[PDB]
Every structure is written in C-alpha cells, then in structure tokens.
Ligand binder design. Structure first.
Ligand SMILES: [Ca+2]
Ligand SMILES: [Ca+2]
Ligand SMILES: [Ca+2]
Ligand SMILES: [Ca+2]
Ligand SMILES: [Ca+2]
Ligand SMILES: [Ca+2]
Ligand SMILES: [Ca+2]
Ligand SMILES: [Ca+2]
Ligand SMILES: [Ca+2]
Ligand SMILES: [Ca+2]
Ligand SMILES: [Ca+2]
Ligand SMILES: [Ca+2]
Ligand SMILES: [Mg+2]
Ligand SMILES: [Mg+2]
Ligand SMILES: [Mg+2]
Ligand SMILES: [Mg+2]
Ligand SMILES: [Mg+2]
Ligand SMILES: [Mg+2]
Ligand SMILES: [Mg+2]
Ligand SMILES: [Mg+2]
Ligand SMILES: [Mg+2]
Ligand SMILES: [Mg+2]
Ligand code: NA
Ligand code: NA
Lengths: 356, 10, 356, 10
C-alpha cells in the first residue's frame, strides 16, 4: 500500500499554513507518513520549514509531494470539524471529506530536495528572539549590492545574543541576556530567513551551523542558509565620545517629527534640528517654499547646534523604541547621532546626518 | 548624503 | 482683514477627511468663512464634496484654497484636543497650534471651479441607499468601452428607488420602497461617484438633476456629473420563463463553489453544475488534469441538466446575497440563470453561462 | 463566453 492518512482539519490547518509560507516541485509540500507522524516540508532551496503532526487515526507509511497552496486552500475551505482523508492514486493525491473530492497532481518524494553541521546551540524565550529581531529589522538593507547587508547579523558573545542591521545610512543593534555561557559566533541571516523566523514566534531552540541556522519551535523546524561576507563591526560605527546629550519624551518627539515631515522634500525628507538650552526646534521646508516649525521642551545643557536628518530614518528609530523617554547623543553636524531609550541600553541606534 | 563609516562603502 | 478662524481639531477632522477624498488647484480645498460657518470644498471637476463646520470662536470672513492632503495630515497629526488657528499671510496660509507652525502655499479662491437644475427630490434612510448600492456595485463594468456600463443606474419608479449594474456577463438589480410617490427617472452615476456616495453613508436627501446628482447627508453635500448613454433595460435581460427552480442553503452552496474554484482554470474559472432530483454536483478541472467534485443536497424536481459558469461570478452573487437560502432559476445550458434570495425579491442577479 | 443580450454588445 501507499501513503494514507486521515486527520482532523483543525490538527492540519495551522501546520499547513506555516509550511506553505519558481520550479514546480518547489511549489509542493513533501508529505511523509512514518511512525505515527505526518511530516510536511516546504522549501525554496535555501530555507526549509518542517511541521510534524501526530496521527491519531490509522495510517499507512509513505510519501509524496503535492501543490502546497492548493492543498492548504482545500483544507481551509472545508467546514469546521471536517475529517480529511488522503491517499495516493497513480500520479494524483486524492483528498476526501464528506461528499467533497479533490485529485491533486503529485511529483515523487524522491525528487524533493534535502539539505548540516552544528556549532552552537542555545534556548531562549520566543519573546526574547522577537524583541531582538523587531529592534533591528527595519535597518536592514533592501537589495543593496553589498549582499551581506540585506540580512541581519546574529552574534553570540558572553551570555548575550545580539542582532545588528545596517543599510549604510542607519544602524540598529540590540543585545539580550540568555543566561547561558555561549561561544563567540556571528552569522548573517538573509532577510527572507529573518521574516520566516518571525512567522514562527507565535521556548525556542537555536542551532547555528557552519553555513546554516536552525530554529526549533514547538512541532516546527526552520532552517536557513547563511549569507557569506564580512558584516560591519557595530563597535566601530558607534560614535566615539558623543558629548552633547538631549533627553525628550518619545511620544512628543515622534509626534513633532511626524508633523514636520509633512512639509519636507518628498525625495530627500530632510528636517533641521536646532538644539539650545532645554529646547529643540525642528524645521522642514520643501521646493514649494512651504515651512513647518515645531518647538519642544527637552533636557539639554550643551552648546547650541544645528543638524540635519532624513526624518524617515529618525521616525523609524522612535517607532522601534516604544519607550517613555529617548536620549540623543550628539557630537557635531557632520557626525552620526546615537539614539537610545533613556531607561535601557539593550538597544542602540546610529543615524548619519544630512548636510545642511 | 554622507554614509556611516562602513568598510567598505561608507 | 483676510480670512481667519480658530477651531477645535475634533470639529475639523472628520469633515476634512471626507472632503479630501491632477492639476494643482484640484489638489486644494476651497475654504470659505461666512456667517459663522467654515465651508470646505473638494473637487475633481466632475464631482464635488462640500462640508460645513460651525465656527464657535471669533472669525473673519474670507476665502482661500490650500493643499488638501497636507492640511488634513497636519490637523490629524496635532494632539487630541488641539485648537487650530488659521490666517492668511501673503501667498500662504498660516496654521498655528501650540508651538507648532505650518505655512502652506495657496491658490486664489476665485480660481477654484464651481458647478445646476433639479428635477426630482426624495429622502430615504442611509441604510436603504447603502443596501441598494451594495446589492449591485460588484456587477458594474470596469473600463468597458461602453462607458455607460462603468457606472450604476439609479431609477425612480412608483414608490421605489432601484439600482442596476451590468458588465455584459452578469447583471444585478435591486429595488426598495421609499414611501413617496416619485416621477419616473433613470440616470447613470459614474463608478467614482458611487464610491464617493458610499463614503458618506456613515437620513439622506437626494436631488436628481438634468446632468448631475446631489446628495445631502448631515453637514455634507456631494454632487456628481451623470454619464451619458443608453443604459440597458434590465427587464429585457431577466430570463423570460425560467422553469427549473433549485433551492439550496446559501452558506453550503457558497462554500462548495469556493472549494471547487481552487481546481478551476485560473484564466477561465469554469465550473460545471449537474442538476438532478434534489441534488447538485459541482465539478472543476484545470489544465494540469486536477479535479474537484462537490455533491450537495438541494431542493430540485426538474429535468436533469448540465450548465457551466465562471465560478467567480457565481461567488460574487452568493456573497452579495447574505441570506439563508438561495433560489436559482434555470432554463437551459446556453441561457442565463436568475439568482435570488429564496425569501426576498428585492434583488435579482442574472449570470450568463459558459459553454461546456 | 456568450454575453447577456445587451443592446448593443451582447
Ligand atoms: Ca471532526
Ligand atoms: Ca474543531
Ligand atoms: Ca486507482
Ligand atoms: Ca499542480
Ligand atoms: Ca525614562
Ligand atoms: Ca542599562
Ligand atoms: Ca481643545
Ligand atoms: Ca476631544
Ligand atoms: Ca504677513
Ligand atoms: Ca503645495
Ligand atoms: Ca429562506
Ligand atoms: Ca417578496
Ligand atoms: Mg484520484
Ligand atoms: Mg532534511
Ligand atoms: Mg505566525
Ligand atoms: Mg567593520
Ligand atoms: Mg560618523
Ligand atoms: Mg506664513
Ligand atoms: Mg457651488
Ligand atoms: Mg465614511
Ligand atoms: Mg436595452
Ligand atoms: Mg440569456
Ligand atoms: Na527642505
Ligand atoms: Na476546466
């Protein structure tokens, strides 16, 4: 006999949805029945997602590949509570439920691609991984010719896991304690791998390999290739001795930049900051000679200074911080700023100014 | 539009 | 002195949002202060939206035009409860609130375009207008060379208001009692006018003019040009004597078509219906030789028949009906079907079959 | 793909 199983819709649905997230067989899921378990695997040849579903009902071992989006859409479209029977009939997979029948094309399991050497392993809460990624994801490059910038650095150091992302105009770094003594390792996860890892974080075990990373979450296993290349060292990017410290409420500062942005140049998005004793003035103008001005009370006792920024990059940081008060650490008008939560040093943001 | 001091590319 | 007013944010915000929904002055709102009222007008040269806002605070009469999306975004971006002061300064409009300042370019009010002869007038509940439009909107044509099909017929007859829409492959008609004796009139409202009217329906007074239609809703007035052309007569499209009547539960029928659709041709979307005594079989197949089959219990006592349909057009009807049971009224395999709520004749849908 | 009997255009 060939592969056969019967499974409740609600046992199949979420696993199918997650693995279903080019070439014909790469649009298929590998389905394998073995030892009381249905395994479902999806891949794009660089990363892979595997789900395991316990089989409560009688089944027969075997394997096939079947179109992933069609099979998911069929199962989702069946009524709540439906039992779904699957068997193989020649070159098709027959799906039956109630008086519904679906015959899907298959390709042989033996033709489905398969990937491994592990080097560091640790466990951490899903919320911690999510914080690390959300703190830095927005600063990754998009289609930069420097391929290693299109992803995210994951680094272990001491008892901490760290993420770094940069596109050359801004950088984000976030570190969190893991409570385990870790070897030093730093790998680049491609953008699409970062996105897939986030989709799973609904503890987590991570294995970092030579050329791949693997995440175990519940009954799922995700694997991604790593990016070659030398990622920038964030320690060299942080401003060395930023002597001028401004503190402001995060909501009020963000709201002010967001209003000023309305009258900034649509292409270049430049705003001007004038810092003076306990005061920040933000101005914007555009080619139509329209002008915005915002004045805010802040905590600041340094020299007066004027510095320009792409307001989108500033708003991106303030939206990622989600805190009560922010600290901006300045040096001069042609040097980057460091921005951080006034109450936490777990994340830091570096933004290059524009020339005025 | 200066860049951060990334090596290479700034 | 020139135009000047001060107004609470929350008195301005929703009116600004609605009127803000090419050429430079057509991206501006006309603002007019007169007799304790601020009027705001937007237009695209074919339709126009006017809002009136009562002015509680001192003001000075006048008028200007100002960029609509910028002014809206500024007001929305100000803090809850903000008071917004507006005055004119040379060729700019100065907006002040707190320590925020915005200077927007203006164009003269005298350059803003302005439209009228009324022929029928009636009032009806906003929910009734919304039902009429939602019942038929999905059957309007999109960019058909027959320009009159890209909109919606509004017809008064007896005590009823009726909408009709068709794209040549399907037709929708809906009629509702208005409780007033109306003259017979039928006008074509362009697609974009139908969309704008729906945005306002959050009683309604309607005036149908020679070449325009006007809707009064609260403190808003919307006007649209009408479309020239001879709209099809729906009475000639309805099947003459559809002798074969099928009744089925709307949810079960829709769910079955939605599953079968998964394995239909992506371009042509054809499904096959086989009608037999108290039974409906739906089948779909695609170029990959995949196949779906659904069998449903229905109420039917006619001759057996097989008929093909674009499943998207059938699903569009079933989703618009939102009822318990549906009646399909059939004649033969090459003639249109009529579909209606088994419990209501207020709306009817006509769908042309595909050849098998 | 027959049309409804619209005059003109079917
Ligand atoms: Ca069940
Ligand atoms: Ca259930
Ligand atoms: Ca067989
Ligand atoms: Ca296929
Ligand atoms: Ca704080
Ligand atoms: Ca700290
Ligand atoms: Ca107030
Ligand atoms: Ca309020
Ligand atoms: Ca002046
Ligand atoms: Ca402007
Ligand atoms: Ca009924
Ligand atoms: Ca009736
Ligand atoms: Mg089969
Ligand atoms: Mg494997
Ligand atoms: Mg998820
Ligand atoms: Mg470096
Ligand atoms: Mg620098
Ligand atoms: Mg001014
Ligand atoms: Mg007028
Ligand atoms: Mg609305
Ligand atoms: Mg006609
Ligand atoms: Mg016909
Ligand atoms: Na500017
Ligand atoms: Na087909």
């Amino acid at each position: 006999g060939r592969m056969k199983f019967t499974v409740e819709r609600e046992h199949l649905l979420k696993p199918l949805q997650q693995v279903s997230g080019t070439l014909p067989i790469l649009g298929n899921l590998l389905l394998q029945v073995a030892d009381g378990t249905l395994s479902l695997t999806g891949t794009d040849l660089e990363m892979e997602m595997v789900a395991r579903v316990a089989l409560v009902q009688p089944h027969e071992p075997g394997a096939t590949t079947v179109p992933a989006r069609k099979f998911f859409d069929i199962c989702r479209g069946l009524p709540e509570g439906a039992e779904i029977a699957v068997q193989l009939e020649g070159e098709r997979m027959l799906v039956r439920s109630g008086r519904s029948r679906f015959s899907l094309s298959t390709l042989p399991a033996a033709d489905f691609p398969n990937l491994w050497q592990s080097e560091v392993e640790f466990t951490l809460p899903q919320a911690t991984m999510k914080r690390l990624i959300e703190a830095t994801q927005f600063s990754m490059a998009h289609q930069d010719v420097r391929y290693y910038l299109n992803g995210m650095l994951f680094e272990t150091e001491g008892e901490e896991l760290r993420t770094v992302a940069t596109d050359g105009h801004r950088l984000a770094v976030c570190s969190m304690p893991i409570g385990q003594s870790l070897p030093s390792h730093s790998v680049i996860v491609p953008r699409k791998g970062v996105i897939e890892l986030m989709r799973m974080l609904d503890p987590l075990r991570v294995q970092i390999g030579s050329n791949n990373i693997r995440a175990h979450v519940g009954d799922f296993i995700f694997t991604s290739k790593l990016v070659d290349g030398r990622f920038p060292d964030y320690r060299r990017v942080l401003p060395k001795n930023p002597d001028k410290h401004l503190e402001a409420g995060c909501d009020l500062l963000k709201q002010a930049f967001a209003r000023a942005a309305i009258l900034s140049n649509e292409k270049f998005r430049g705003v001007r900051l004038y810092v003076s004793e306990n005061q920040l003035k933000i101005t914007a103008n555009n080619p139509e000679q329209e002008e915005a001005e915002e004045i805010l009370d802040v905590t600041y006792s340094g020299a007066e200074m004027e510095i320009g920024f792409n307001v989108s990059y500033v708003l991106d940081v303030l939206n990622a911080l989600k805190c009560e008060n922010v600290r901006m650490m300045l040096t001069d008008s042609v040097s980057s700023v460091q921005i951080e939560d006034a109450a936490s040093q777990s994340a830091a943001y570096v933004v290059m100014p524009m020339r005025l | 539009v200066p860049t951060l001091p990334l090596v290479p590319x700034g």
